[PDB]
Curated annotation (Swiss-Prot):
Outcome of mutating S12A: No phosphorylation
The protein's assembly and partners: Interacts with CUX1 (via DNA-binding domains); the interaction inhibits the attachment of both proteins to DNA. Homodimer. Part of the nuclear protein complex gamma-globin promoter and enhancer binding factor (gamma-PE) composed at least of SATB1 and HOXB2. Interaction with CtBP1 when not acetylated stabilizes attachment to DNA and promotes transcription repression. Interacts with PCAF. Interacts with sumoylated PML and HDAC1 via the CMP domain. Interacts also with DYNLT3 and POLR2J2. Binds to EP300.
Post-translational modification: Sumoylated. Sumoylation promotes cleavage by caspases. Phosphorylated by PKC. Acetylated by PCAF. Phosphorylated form interacts with HDAC1, but unphosphorylated form interacts with PCAF. DNA binding properties are activated by phosphorylation and inactivated by acetylation. In opposition, gene expression is down-regulated by phosphorylation but up-regulated by acetylation.
Stated name of the protein: DNA-binding protein SATB1
Organism: Homo sapiens
Disease listed for this protein: Den Hoed-de Boer-Voisin syndrome: A disorder characterized by global developmental delay, moderately to severely impaired intellectual development, poor or absent speech, delayed motor skills, and early-onset epilepsy in many patients. Most affected individuals have feeding difficulties, poor overall growth, dysmorphic facial features, and significant dental anomalies resembling amelogenesis imperfecta. More variable features include visual defects, behavioral abnormalities, and non-specific involvement of other organ systems. Developmental delay with dysmorphic facies and dental anomalies: A disorder characterized by mild global developmental delay, impaired intellectual development, walking by 2 to 3 years, and slow language acquisition. The severity of the disorder ranges from moderate cognitive deficits to mild learning difficulties or behavioral abnormalities. Most patients have dysmorphic facial features, abnormal dentition and non-specific visual defects. DEFDA transmission pattern is consistent with autosomal dominant inheritance with incomplete penetrance and variable expressivity.
Domain CUTL: 6-73
Localization per Swiss-Prot or TrEMBL: Nucleus matrix; Nucleus, PML body
Function noted in UniProt: Crucial silencing factor contributing to the initiation of X inactivation mediated by Xist RNA that occurs during embryogenesis and in lymphoma. Binds to DNA at special AT-rich sequences, the consensus SATB1-binding sequence (CSBS), at nuclear matrix- or scaffold-associated regions. Thought to recognize the sugar-phosphate structure of double-stranded DNA. Transcriptional repressor controlling nuclear and viral gene expression in a phosphorylated and acetylated status-dependent manner, by binding to matrix attachment regions (MARs) of DNA and inducing a local chromatin-loop remodeling.
Organism taxonomic ancestry: Eukaryota, Metazoa, Chordata, Craniata, Vertebrata
Tissue specificity: Expressed predominantly in thymus.
Shown part of the complete sequence: 179 to 246 of 763
Protein family membership: Belongs to the CUT homeobox family.
């Protein structure tokens, strides 16, 4: 159930990347950028980098809020 998704303040860069990779199984990067608060560049970096992602707390929370709402529809 969508209500069991972590609340925004619990999202880390790990939560964001894990969500992103499941999302990208069913939509492409361009579509994800249209939907969510991450930029094209940040999405690309998460997909491609060999290093951990730098995502601010504010952006993690913004993403987690979006994601839970997106799953609820």
């Amino acid at each position: 159930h969508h209500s069991h998704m972590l609340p925004p303040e619990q999202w880390s860069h790990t939560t964001v990347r894990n969500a992103l990779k499941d999302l990208l199984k069913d939509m492409n990067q361009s579509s994800l950028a249209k939907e969510c608060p991450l930029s094209q560049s940040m999405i690309s970096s998460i997909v491609n980098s060999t290093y951990y992602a730098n995502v601010s707390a504010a952006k993690c929370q913004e993403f987690g809020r979006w994601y839970k709402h997106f799953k609820k529809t």
